[PDB]
Nucleic acid binder design. Structure first.
Ligand SMILES: [Zn+2]
Ligand SMILES: [Zn+2]
Lengths: 146, 177, 82, 156, 94, 37
RNA sequence: CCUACUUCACAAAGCGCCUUCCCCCGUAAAUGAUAUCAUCUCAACUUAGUAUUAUACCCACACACCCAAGAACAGGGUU
């Protein structure tokens, strides 16, 4: 990781950079998620996993750099949005209602004033459809709409 | 066993005081627990006509958490009865106005729709914050487990756990980040 | 060390099958409360109905009287069991 | 096949390791011997029993009364043995059949204390605007049995 | 006496005192009354469980509305257990 | 803004951005191109 | 509400007089990633941006006569 320092005169210095842990469970895997056997085994609240693909101020890292699949990058981005909205990354910020599994940005959803009839009800989305295929240990599948 | 008749009956039909902590808990799950306890459906001696309900004291109701965008999408509708008296207020607005209305309404909706519902609600004690009246605190008997386990934040994760969790990728050294 | 259920409450349950395997024996001696888990013994119509409702955590409706019809329909010698 | 510890990496339920069969069988023998010794020494008070009689299961104890909804073809005061005893239980132990306990284990005895007819039950059919109205009165025969004793034997 | 209770048939007064006398006869120190469980202490419908402990050993616990009533009932239960007239005692043999 | 069910960029400077829940076509050079879903 | 004027007259009225106080959100912008530019953000986020109407009003309570109180009841006064 290179950082730019000013004094005006400005220069870039490369500092310590973490390395992937030795002995991946699944070497010769497409993305890091596959290499570590996490294809369908992480959720929005797995901050330890998510923060490894996050800029220090909360922004996501580019797919080219991270090496993630297209679908895995999308999943990580959505999970990170949900974690930010749930307040699970208090240190990754640009510079009071508790939530979680919030798909939409809170400021862009209108109230459901007229929920339709029973056969055409307007349901409130929960979680993200990108995580529909996550490992389900429950008898019933995840309900993405409430 | 071996109790006298009146003490035995009193013990069997006594009403217990339970404590729920609403911090970061879904009001729906809180209401399900509270409704079971209020109806007495958690007692094997339960019967609709036995008036076997218990007391439920829910604290930190101001700090409940909705899944999804329910804070903005869920709407509570009421009518004053007068023309033009239809009021539709979002969950966030209702929570700001009354820090107890959301949980109260959830439990009310989950309770059976009969004449015992308001008697049951009389046994429900909702408190926005950690403070509880002293008499209620002395009454408390048991604390029910929180229905939802609150996920930890990075600020809360211990350095040992972070070390235990492997590094997933080799970031290029020459990257601004 | 495996226990079918927590042994703290209401008894210590021990399941078993007879040698023939055609009957199940359960040994469930009751668990006494430890002494350390115990504490030493310490040493007008409107307003009236409001007070009673507050006292017994009920509503006002049950404290109002009923008519002669119901008061006389009520059975004063109900059957008693046990 | 290692998976880093995430929320969904492992099942949400605790892992349970059942006791090894050999040690568990030895433990079952020990427990059965203990309960058999309790029976031998008579270390029990009231005995209750779930007994399948007629078509139903009755939770029964000595001196209890049972109302069978049919005539039993037995003279009043006649003593009987109830043979389908599903469960026998005491203060400190219970024995469960699979699905029935053996004859050698439990002996539930009853007595035909009374033979009677049930109170008149009304069966009325009615359909509106069809001139369809029917009434019948039925008195089901009944037998009251008193459970005299529940005996167990050290045959485990 | 089938279905009857010991003190339903034999009326007694001061069961705690009588239990103390019985334990003295059996050469046992006086029991310590202790609050094992309670509910709604400050309400109008409290439940109190009072256990009598003999050298930190529970001999009998009883329920009640007030602490005094619970202690009295616990004394009655202890007396029943001592005299062998417990509710779950062996039936009479006929 | 003009309300359109299908958003089409009209010139080079027209750009699509999803804001406050819905898509918009914004354009500095020709604000006439402003479209809202 | 009746000081005037007027219908009128121990008072009721208007044609007469007096008092009337807070927002709502469509968008326009700052910083900034996914996508190292850019980007108002169903990304985290910062403003215009606010409702959680702010308050105001009422709050005591055991015959008979009068009353600006009133169908009755009720209410106010009786020093
Ligand atoms: Zn892959
Ligand atoms: Zn353009």
């Amino acid at each position: 990781f290179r950082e730019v320092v000013e004094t005006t005169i400005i220069e870039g210095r490369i500092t310590a950079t973490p390395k992937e842990s030795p002995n991946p469970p699944n070497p010769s895997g497409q993305c890091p998620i596959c290499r570590w056997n996490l294809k369908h085994k992480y959720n929005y609240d797995d901050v330890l996993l998510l923060s490894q693909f996050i800029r220090p101020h909360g922004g996501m890292l580019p797919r080219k750099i991270t090496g993630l699949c297209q679908e895995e990058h999308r999943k990580i981005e959505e999970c990170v949005k949900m974690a930010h909205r749930a307040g699970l990354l208090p240190n990754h910020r640009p510079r009071q209602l508790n939530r979680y599994l919030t798909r939409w940005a809170p400021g862009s959803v209108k109230p459901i004033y007229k929920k339709g009839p029973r056969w055409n009800r307007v349901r409130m989305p929960v979680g993200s459809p990108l995580l529909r295929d996550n490992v389900c240990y429950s008898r019933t599948p995840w309900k993405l709409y409430h | 066993s071996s109790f006298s008749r009146a003490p035995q009956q009193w013990a069997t039909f006594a009403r217990i005081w339970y404590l729920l902590d609403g911090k970061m808990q879904p009001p729906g799950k809180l209401a399900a627990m509270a409704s079971i306890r209020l109806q007495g459906l958690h007692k094997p001696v339960y019967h609709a006509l036995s008036d076997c309900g218990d007391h439920v004291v829910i604290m930190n109701t101001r700090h409940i958490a909705f899944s999804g965008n329910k804070w903005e999408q869920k709407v509570y509708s009421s009518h004053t009865g007068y023309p033009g008296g239809f009021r539709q207020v979002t969950a966030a607005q209702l929570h700001l106005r009354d820090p107890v209305a959301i949980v109260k309404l959830a439990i009310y909706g989950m309770l059976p729709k009969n004449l015992h519902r308001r008697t049951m609600m009389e046994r429900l004690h909702l408190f926005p914050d950690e403070y509880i009246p002293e008499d209620i605190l002395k009454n408390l008997v048991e604390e029910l487990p929180q229905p939802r386990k609150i996920p930890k934040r990075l600020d809360e994760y211990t350095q040992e756990e972070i070390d235990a969790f492997p590094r997933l990728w080799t970031p290029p050294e020459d990257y601004r980040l | 060390t495996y226990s079918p259920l927590p042994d703290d409450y209401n008894c210590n349950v021990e399941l078993a099958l007879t040698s023939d395997g055609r009957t199940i024996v359960c040994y469930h001696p009751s668990v006494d409360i430890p002494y350390e888990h115990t504490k030493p013994i310490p040493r007008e119509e409107g307003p009236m109905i409001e007070q009673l409702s507050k006292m017994f955590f009920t509503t006002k409706h049950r404290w109002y009287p009923h008519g002669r019809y119901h008061r006389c329909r009520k059975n004063l010698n109900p059957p008693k069991d046990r | 096949g290692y998976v880093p510890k995430t929320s969904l990496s492992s099942p949400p339920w605790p892992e349970v390791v059942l006791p090894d069969p050999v040690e568990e069988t030895r433990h079952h023998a020990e427990v059965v011997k203990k309960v058999n010794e309790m029976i031998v020494t008579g270390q029990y008070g009231r005995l209750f029993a779930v007994v399948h009689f007629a078509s139903r299961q009755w939770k029964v104890t000595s001196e209890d009364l049972i109302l069978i909804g049919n005539e039993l073809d037995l003279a009043c005061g006649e003593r009987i043995r109830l043979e389908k005893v599903l469960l026998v239980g005491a203060d400190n132990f219970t024995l469960l059949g699979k699905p029935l306990l053996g004859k050698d284990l439990v002996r539930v005895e009853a007595t035909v204390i009374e033979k009677t007819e049930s109170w008149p039950r009304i069966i009325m059919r009615f359909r509106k605007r069809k001139n369809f109205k029917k009434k019948r009165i039925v008195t089901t025969p009944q037998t009251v049995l008193r459970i005299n004793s529940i005996e167990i034997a050290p045959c485990l | 006496m089938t279905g009857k209770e010991l003190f339903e048939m034999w009326k007694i007064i001061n069961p705690m005192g009588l239990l103390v006398e019985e334990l003295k006869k059996r050469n046992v120190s006086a029991p310590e009354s202790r609050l094992t469980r309670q509910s709604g202490g400050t309400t109008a419908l409290p439940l109190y469980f009072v256990g009598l402990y003999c050298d930190k050993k529970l001999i009998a616990e009883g329920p009640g509305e007030t602490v005094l009533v619970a202690e009295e009932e616990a004394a009655r239960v202890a007396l029943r257990k001592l005299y062998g007239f417990t509710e779950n005692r062996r039936p009479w043999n006929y | 803004f003009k309300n359109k069910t299908v958003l089409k960029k009209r010139c080079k400077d027209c750009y699509l951005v999803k804001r406050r829940g819905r898509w918009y076509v914004y354009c500095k050079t020709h604000p006439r191109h402003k479209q809202r879903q």
